Amino acid sequence: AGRISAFLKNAWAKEPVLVVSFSVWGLAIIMPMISPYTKYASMINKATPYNYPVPVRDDGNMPDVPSHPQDPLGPSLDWLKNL
Amino acid sequence: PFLDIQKKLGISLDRHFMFLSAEQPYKNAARCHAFEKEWIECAHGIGGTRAKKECKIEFDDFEECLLRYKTMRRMHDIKKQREKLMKEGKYTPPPHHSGREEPRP
Amino acid sequence: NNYIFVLSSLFLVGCLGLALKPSPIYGGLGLIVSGFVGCLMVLGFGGSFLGLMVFLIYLGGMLVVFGYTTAMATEEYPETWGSNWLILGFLVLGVIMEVFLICVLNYYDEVGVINLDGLGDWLMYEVDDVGVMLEGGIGVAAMYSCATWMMVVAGWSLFAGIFIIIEITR
Amino acid sequence: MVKRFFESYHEVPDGTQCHRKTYITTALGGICGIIGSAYSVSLNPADSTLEAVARVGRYTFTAAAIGAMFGLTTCVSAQVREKPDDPLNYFIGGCAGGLTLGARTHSYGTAAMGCVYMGTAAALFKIGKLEGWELFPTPKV
Amino acid sequence: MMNGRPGHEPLKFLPDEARSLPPPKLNDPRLVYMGLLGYCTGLMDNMLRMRPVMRAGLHRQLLFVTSFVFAGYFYLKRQNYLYAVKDHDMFGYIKLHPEDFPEKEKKTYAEILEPFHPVR
Amino acid sequence: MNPITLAIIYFTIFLGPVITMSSTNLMLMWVGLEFSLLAIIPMLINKKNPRSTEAATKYFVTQATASMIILLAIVLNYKQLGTWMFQQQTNGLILNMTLMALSMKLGLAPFHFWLPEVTQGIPLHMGLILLTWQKIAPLSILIQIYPLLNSTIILMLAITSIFMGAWGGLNQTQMRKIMAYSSIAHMGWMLAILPYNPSLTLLNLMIYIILTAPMFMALMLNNSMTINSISLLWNKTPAMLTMISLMLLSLGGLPPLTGFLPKWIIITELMKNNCLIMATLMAMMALLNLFFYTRLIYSTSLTMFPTNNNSKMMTHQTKTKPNLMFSTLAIMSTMTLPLAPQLI
Amino acid sequence: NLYTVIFINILLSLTLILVAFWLPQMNLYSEKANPYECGFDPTSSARLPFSMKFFLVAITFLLFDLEIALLLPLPWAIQTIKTSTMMIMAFILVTILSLGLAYEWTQKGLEWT
Amino acid sequence: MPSTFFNLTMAFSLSLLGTLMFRSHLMSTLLCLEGMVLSLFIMTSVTSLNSNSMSSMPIPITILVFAACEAAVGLALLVKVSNTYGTDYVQNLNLLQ
Amino acid sequence: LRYGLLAAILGDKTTKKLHEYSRVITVDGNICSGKNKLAKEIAQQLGMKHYPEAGIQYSSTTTGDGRPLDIEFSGSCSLEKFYDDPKSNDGNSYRLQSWLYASRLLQYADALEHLLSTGQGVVLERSIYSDFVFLEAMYNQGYIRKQCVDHYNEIKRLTLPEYLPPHAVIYIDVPVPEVQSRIQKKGDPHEMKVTSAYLQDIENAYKKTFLPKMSEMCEVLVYDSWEAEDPTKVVEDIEYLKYNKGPWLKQDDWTFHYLRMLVQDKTEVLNYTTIPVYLPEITIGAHQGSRIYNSFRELPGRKYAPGYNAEVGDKWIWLK
Ligand SMILES: Nc1nc2c(ncn2[C@H]2C[C@H](O)[C@@H](COP(=O)(O)OP(=O)(O)OP(=O)(O)O)O2)c(=O)[nH]1
Ligand SMILES: [Mg+2]
Incomplete structure (x- = not known):
């Protein structure tokens, strides 16, 4: 198991640019899989207001869709205003 | 298709930008989107030969919307009549069309 | 006000010179010149x-296209637009054919193609005024997300282009 | 207006309207000679543009000669026989056209070849327009 | 035609109605011809590869006969389904339009008058 | 040619017809046609002879300007309809642009002049992948738009391709050029049938592929370049002589072999579609395919030509260049006329 | 605005060419207008064919410029909602570009011929 | 708009006349081919801008990438032609007759 | 299995096989210049493979039965008949020379197959890069004609530059009276009958045409007869050569694999020397060729493909 380490240290001493490039490449490949903030990027891009989400009609049916904009119902943003 | 592998596997790979009335980034609708939607939903599985005599009114309205040929012809005779009436001197121009008025927002 | 028609006639002149084929x-x-005209x-x-x-992709391609013209396909006494007189007569013939085409095209059709005070008014069809995304950048940004097969086939075109060009130039 | 100008071949029968009958047959021969001379100049070029336009004039003179004398001989054969509904006037007009084509190119063997082949083709065109055959049919079945 | 027929499963080799068709037998002359084709495939391949054309390559001849009979039975089932569904679409269109495809009440030979053409 | 670029070039020439036959976006099968052009070019130049670069640049300039004409047709479809796929209510000028560009890439007779010269400068296993596999994809977009194709330009293209596939093979005595011309006559047949029944276009494409691909494998088997080089077959490999004779006369199209069946079913659907004298002219000018194939069959397997003294080592050495695919597509072509309704 | 700034830059540089040409005194002859190459007349014509030595690396400069124009919409594609397939598509095409340049680096055509 | 689109159609018909004839070089024909690349980009972007169909903005970068990649293939094809010949001209290529 | 691309990608690359003791040596001279003794000593001392001088019956003893076949099967030419009647009305000289050139083409193919298969070097006396000097000595003696020279130059232009040149070209030069003295001391009654002008013509043709053609591109070592009699100095000057200047130092492993694809099957090796050019010296007629094929297939061992002959004793013919 010393041959791979000797080749890695020899390339590190001689031409370290491809070693740094492949290490940063593998870090960029594996670091979204490690980091817990990968799932917050889709939350950011969903919870941004970007167009008008239009009001819907009601027959007294759904309780989750609010009437006042300052109601506690609906998808809140305490994970973005405080965090 | 010839090999209908997208319909076989059920996954759209080039099919979600096929016409003008496909889904758009950040929900911004194209021009003549309602005309294209009513043209496809009037040609909804009718067939090509029956649809070109059936929804010819909806295609003619959508083609008129998209290329605006009779609209530009109408504005062309309106502008030619404006040049003829300004050379005649009969048409006093309104100040709303001249632009010398306070505008509403 | 007649910016796009003046630029498109200049594009017709530049593609006419390219079509009349100098060195x-x-x-x-x-x-x-036609690329700067089309970018504008x-x-x-x-x-x-x-x-x-x-302009970026065309300046960067056409740089080394220009280098290949001045390396490979060059000639001791080249032909510009003013060198060969059949090319110069074809240039003034194409210029008078273009202005005779617009001089017959404002008169034959009786539609809104060319009018002396009514051209340029039918250029912008509809952009949304209160909308926020109307430029062309976000639609070509959407080929990463919606039209993913476009980037698959373009990356495969460039990968196969590298391999195909190594096999050609070997 | 070119196609409805060329449709004077069938709206008036042969044995009448002979001057413009010969004119539209010469115009069909001139169109075929212009595109054949353009094919011959673009395929096998001459050493000079004067020789190329002389080749163009010779080819369109040969094709205008066979078209003009084919239409004129089928018109005077309809004049002599006074029957419009036969293919034999087109047969003898195509044979006179092939004879004049072989007299232009100066070989009696291809004069006989042009006589029998364009007489067969002219009788086939007349027999198709008599029995209502379709040259370029729309797909119906 | 069959690409534009309604209810068509796209790129399906055998749909569920091909099971509702009767399947072809193994004694059928098209499969007999394809078994002869597989034996002729083995004979031609052994002749080109310079073999005894009967003695050598018996396993390759057996694979040729079996794969030819297999592909021919599956293609024969698909083509029988295609001609049966052509008959079904035609009979359905005939049942849909009797006023566009009327019954031809042909008159009898006593009633009609065929012109007599004597040769002598 | 390393195996990495060999695998990517073969996968791209597999991929281009696959995305062409799979996609319904008109620019996406333009993209597949561009993959076809791109992956064919280093295979054309990879022998590195001076004729191969000439054939490669002839192929590139013709197929690239046809790619630009069909891209004009796709962009004018975007102006006229706003969609991408060819629908029913479009102008005939754009469809004529499409048919002219696709006849340029397919090699029909007002555009055919690159195809014998392109086939002459290349080795035979590139003629295998250019003569059969390359012409699936422009034919497949032309199958996809079959109600929109205008029958006048389709039938004039068919008449000229039957006429010049008849009139290009008799003067010219090289094998790759003579089978480019016979292929030009065969796409004259499968462009004649195209707006009437595209299943018979697929049938004539499949019969022409299984009739030309083992014939190009038989040319590959001895590298037989000329008519005298295929006339040396009785001392090189005499065992293929009656099979290449049956394949030659079947590619000409005689009964009871399979090549009559495209002519028979094209005549069947053409007289169902009421086109009498023009299909008569097609089937009457089809006999010059048997003129160059009967001269070629008299060269290879009906007269034993003079051999030379150095062909006795071709009798001496063993040969492993026969493939199983040659024998199975050879007999699957040459005896399938009693299976012809299942072949429909 | 920007057309007027481009045209006043045209007018400024054209005014500088006019004051560079028309104001200085100038007599010109054939040895003065002889082209310079080290103090002698040139051996051949100066537009004689160069045999180009960076040809395959020149074509991959062109194709890499097509890749960076493919990669130019990615600062607005980072704002998209389907960020998993966006980052997978960006990962697979930068991996495609790095593997193509690694193939050219192993085949050693970066050196001239 | 129809004046601009008909003049772009005239520019394509002119560049068709340019690439459909040969004066002295294959490279000026390839410059006419790249003029067709630029004209189809301008036509596609003008069509997408006035129809406002911004979902089909993946199409003109695919036009540029595929057509400029085959243009680059032809540019190195002319490099291999001039390497195997030493000349470049259109009349040089009559050796396949 | 067989050397395909599928066998090549698993690690059958020739750069691991090739080392310093893997060279193509040709040993060259006039008639009876000690080349076979020097080739046997060179292959014995460096451990290389001694391929002998390929004659008219090389291919029959190389491929197939291994027995030398008859005068009309792998012949239609004889070296004894050429030495008896050189200005032949039957055209014996071109049939001998073209059959000998195709035979040494097969020898060069088998030597390149052996070297690129097992990595061991090979010797090749009077190779295809020096086989033109016998035809041009025949032409300068007037035994054949100008169209014969142009057809052999077309055959050599088809068959030479797809191959690779030899690494070392040993020439043993010897003067024409010593060639006549050794060809009298050998004692063959038909090879005694050759002219001295033919030997002088092949000697000065060798010294004026072949050696500037080969010394400018690959390594050529010259030696006298008394200097090349004792071979230890010859094999040490072969072993201590630098092998720098040559066309073997620019091809890669897949170029060597495509050379093995062009070399390994003989149906593309021997194809370009039987191209149809109808010169009447080498043209076998149709009845003679059909009679020689339908007597060739009735020979034992050559009726079918090898490994498939049930009349000889090739077993397992039932399932193969
Ligand atoms: N006409 C002709 N004769 C050839 C050719 N190649 C070889 N020979 C003849 C010349 C001699 O008769 C014989 C070659 O004999 P060698 O020079 O090898 O002499 P020998 O076998 O005594 O061996 P040695 O040289 O003493 O080691 O083959 C050829 O291309 N043409
Ligand atoms: Mg010796």
Whole structure:
């Protein structure tokens, strides 16, 4: 198991640019899989207001869709205003 | 298709930008989107030969919307009549069309 | 006010010179005059990305196309637009054919193609006034997310292009 | 207006309207000679543009000669026989056209070849227009 | 035609109605011809590869006969389904339009008058 | 040619017809046609002879300007309809642009002049992948738009391709050029049938592929370049002589072999579609395919030509260049006329 | 605005060419207008064919410029909602570009011929 | 708009006349081919801008990438032609007759 | 299995096989210049493979039965008949020379197959890069004609530059009276009958045409007869050569694999020397060729493909 380490240290001493490039490449490949903030990027891009989400009609049916904009119902943003 | 592998596997790979009335980034609708939607939903599985005599009114309205040929012809005779009436001197121009008025927002 | 028609007539003149085919060193100059004209046309139309993107990709391609003209396909006594007199007579013939075409095209059709005070008014069809995304950049940004097969096939075109060009130039 | 100008071949029968009958047959021969001379100049070029335009004039003179004398001989054969509904006037007009084509190119063997082949083709065109055959049919079945 | 027929499963080799068709037998002359084709495939391949054309390559001849009979039975089932569904679409269109495809009440030979053409 | 670029070039020439036959976006099968052009070019130049670069640049300039004409047709479809796929209510000028560009890439007779010269400068296993596999994809977009194709330009293209596939093979005595011309006559047949029944276009494409691909494998088997080089077959490999004779006369199209069946079913659907004298002219000018194939069959397997003294080592050495695919597509072509309704 | 700034830059540089040409005194002859190459007349014509030595690396400069124009919409594609397939598509095409340049680096055509 | 689109159609018909004839070089024909690349980009972007169909903005970068990649293939094809010949001209290529 | 691309990608690359003791040596001279003794000593001392001088009956003893076949099967030419009647009305000289050139083409193919298969070097006396000097000595003696020279130059232009040149070209030069003295001391009654002008013509043709053609591109070592009699100095000057200047130092492993694809099957090796050019010296007629094929297939061992002959004793013919 010393041959791979000797080749890695020899390339590190001689031409370290491809070693740094492949290490940063593998870090960029594996670091979204490690980091817990990968799932917050889709939350950011969903919870941004970007167009008008239009009001819907009601027959007294759904309780989750609010009437006042300052109601506690609906998808809140305490994970973005405080965090 | 010839090999209908997208319909076989059920996954759209080039099919979600096929016409003008496909889904758009950040929900911004194209021009003549309602005309294209009513043209496809009037040609909804009718067939090509029956649809070109059936929804010819909806295609003619959508083609008129998209290329605006009779609209530009109408504005062309309106502008030619404006040049003829300004050379005649009969048409006093309104100040709303001249632009010398306070505008509403 | 007649910006797109004046620029499109200049594009007709530049593609006419490229079509009348000089030494290709001079043809690169005429085609990049047409490229600056087309970049300014898309930037005057509302594509703030597409004209500068074709100026970047076209200046960068046409640089080494120009280098291949002045290396490989060169000639001791070349032909510009003013060198050969059949080319010069064809140039003034194409110029008088273009202005005779617009002089018969404002008169035959009786539609809104060319009018002396009614052209340029039918250029912008509809952009949303209160909307926020109307430039061309976010639609070509959507090929990463919606139209993913476009980026798959373009990356495979460039990968196969590298391998195909190594096999050609070997 | 070119196609409805060329449709004077069938709206009036042969044995009448002979001057413009010969004119539209010469115009069909001139169109075929212009495209054949353009094919011959673009395929096998001459050493000079004067020789190329002389080849163009010779080819369109040969094709205008066979078209003009084919239409004129089928018109005077309709004049002599006074029957419009036969293919034999087109047969003898095509044979006179092939004879004049072989007299232009100066070989009696291809004069006989042009006589029998364009007489067969002219009788086939007349027999198709008599029995209502379709040259370029729309797909119906 | 069959690409534009309604209810068509796209790129399906055998749909569920091909099971509702009767399947072809193994004694059928098209499969007999394809078994002869597989034996002739083995004979031609052994002749080109310079073999005894009967003695050598018996396993390759057996694979040729079996794969030819297999592909021919599956293609024969698909083509029988295609001609049966052509008959079904035609009979359905005939049942839909009797006023566009009327019954031809042919008159009898006593009633009609065929012209007599004597040769002598 | 390393195996990495060999695998990517073969996967791209597999991929281009696959995305062409799979996609319904008109620019996406333009993209597939561009993959076809791109992956064919280093295979054309990879022998590195001076004729191969000439054939490669002839192929590139013709197929690239046809790619630009069909891209004009796709962009004018975007102006006229706003969609991408060819629908029913479009102008005939754009469809004529499409048919002219696709006849340029397919090699029909007002555009055919690159195809014998392109086939002459290349080795035979590139003629295998250019003569059969390359012409699936422009034919497949032309199958996809079959109600929109205008029958006048389709039938004039068919008449000229039957006429010049008849009139290009008799003067010219090289094998790759003579089978480019016979292929030009065969796409004259499968462009004649195209707006009437595209299943018979697929049938004539499949019969022409299984009739030309083992014939190009038989040319590959001895590298038989000329008519005298295929006339040396009785001392090189005499065992293929009656099979290449049956394949030659079947590619000409005689009964009871399979090549009559495209002519028979094209005549069947053409007289169902009421086109009498023009299909008569097609089937009457089809006999010059048997003129160059009967001269070629008299060269290879009906007269034993003079051999030379150095062919006795071709009798001496063993040969492993026969493939199983040659024998199975050889007999699957040459005896399938009693299976012809299942072949429909 | 920007057209007027480009045209006043045209007018400024054209005014500088006019004051560079028309104001200085100038007599010109054939040895003065002889082209310079080290103090002698040139051996051949100066537009004689160069045999180009960076040809395959020149074509991959062109194709890499097509890749960076493919990669130019990615600062607005980072704002998209389907960020998993966006980052997978960006990962697979930068991996495609790095593997193509690694193939050219192993085949050693970066050196001239 | 129809004046601009008909003049772009005239520019394509002119560049069709340019690439459909040969004066002295294959490279000026390839410059006419790249003029067709630029004209189809300008036509596609003008069509997408006035129809406002911004979902089909993946199409003109695919036009540029595929057509300029085949243009680069033809540019190195002319490099291999001039390497195997030493000349470049259109009349040089009559050796396949 | 067989050397395909599928066998090549698993690690059958020739750069691991090739080392310093893997060279193509040709040993060259006039008639009876000690080349076979020097070739046997060179292959014995360096451990290389001694391929002998390929004659008219090389291919029959190389491929197939291994027995030398008859005078009309792998012949239609004889070296004894050429030495008896050189100006032949039957055209014996071109049939001998073209059959000998195709035989040494097969020898060069088998030597390149052996070297690129097992990595061991090979010797090749009077190779295809020096086989033109016998035809041009025949032409300068007037035994054949100008169109014969152009057809052999077309055959050599088809068959030479797809191959690789030899690494070392040993020439043993010897003067024409010593060639006549050794060809009298050998004692063959038909090879005694050759002219001295033919030997002088092949000697000065060798010294004026072949050696500037080969010394400018690959390594050529010259030696006298008394200097090349004792071979230890010859094999040490072969072993201590630098092998720098040559066309073997620019091809890669897949170029060597495509050379093995062009070399390994003989149906593309021997194809370009039987191209149809109808010169009447080498043209076998149709009845003579059909009679020689339908007597060739009735020979034992050559009726079918090898490994498939049930009349000889090739077993397992039932399932193969
Ligand atoms: N006409 C002709 N004769 C050839 C050719 N190649 C070889 N020979 C003849 C010349 C001699 O008769 C014989 C070659 O004899 P060698 O020079 O090898 O002499 P020998 O076998 O005594 O061996 P040695 O040289 O003493 O080691 O083959 C050829 O291309 N043409
Ligand atoms: Mg010796």
